[PDB]
Design a protein around this ligand. Sequence first.
Ligand code: CO
Lengths: 228, 203
Amino acid sequence: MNGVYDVGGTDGLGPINRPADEPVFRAEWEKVAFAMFPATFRAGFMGLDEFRFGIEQMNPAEYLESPYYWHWIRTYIHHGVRTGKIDLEELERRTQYYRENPDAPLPEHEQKPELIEFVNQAVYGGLPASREVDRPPKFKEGDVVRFSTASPKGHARRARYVRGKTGTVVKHHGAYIYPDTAGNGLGECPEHLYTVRFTAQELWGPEGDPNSSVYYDCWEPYIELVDT
Amino acid sequence: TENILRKSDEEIQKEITARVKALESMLIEQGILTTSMIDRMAEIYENEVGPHLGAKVVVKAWTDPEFKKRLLADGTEACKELGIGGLQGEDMMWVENTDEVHHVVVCSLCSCYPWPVLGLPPNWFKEPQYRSRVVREPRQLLKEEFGFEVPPSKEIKVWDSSSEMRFVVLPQRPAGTDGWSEEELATLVTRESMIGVEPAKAV
Ligand SMILES: [Co+2]
């Protein structure tokens, strides 16, 4: 989608706010928001691509100025409601309850060893998106390609700043989960992945740095051949 | 930036805390989230996984030309030699800074970052300001924000992580470090040097 979240190239966002140092978690709620990622993933709320799409659909003004982990909370609620796993009305009732009673206890619950096992496995083993496909790669290193000008309303990894631009294939990484299908609940539908080099001049016109290039990853359908 | 429509940081924190505890209570009742699961995830990224891991990879590459070749050929496989890898680092591609080239990484579309070697990203990396400007004015940004002046003649390669491939910068080894031990060299490798916003520590 042509969301405001796609900030690459956007002007007027202001200076970088960078403290000399900071903690990993600035508040207890952040630790909870963070841990909810593997929890909701295991529960089938969404996959990684869908996770991103939920954030992309946020109110832009809220996205631009809210604490980072709040974005995660928004996507959990988004998918919880989508899948019917979260009743919004009950969530709103409970929110007011904790506003009035912030120190009220959490529900009694049993600890589950399977959830710790999942955490350790996911953290140290990872969640690889690499997949094997039957089709051979259409492109190769050195090929000059042009990025699609398509503008899907659903999830995609097509930054507005690279659309319609011409670049050179730097490397073929093999096939991976395709965002355009995965983030929209249409499955993995793996596609070959390539890193493509775009000169700053090609991307920004004369306002671009005469000696700079941007490397951007493109799934096969994103690019078409110009010169072999 | 100032926004006359925005509540105070205190009110914002109070609202978020209530909303998160509410959502937390519901996921707990559903049996998909537990207090131990939360504590374990927090424990890992607060004490176990961090930039000291990436520093180990960097110093091995600086002192082992063969490992350096393997690292640049396949980052994931190379880091596995040191027992480093996992979540959000399943696919890593390391890029080497030289006298002619400088690399800098970003996730313009969100906040993608190589957690296995750098831990969780600092807030500025995830925010709109850095993400929007680095792909458009990298040279000016590095100088203005990080006090790092990269010569106009030296090429700046910006790596935008639009896929699951995670890019990590192998900074140049600082001069005056001939014969240093891997432990001594590690004191010069910063999280910033592996993102490309700063070179490794001088001297
Ligand atoms: Co990201």
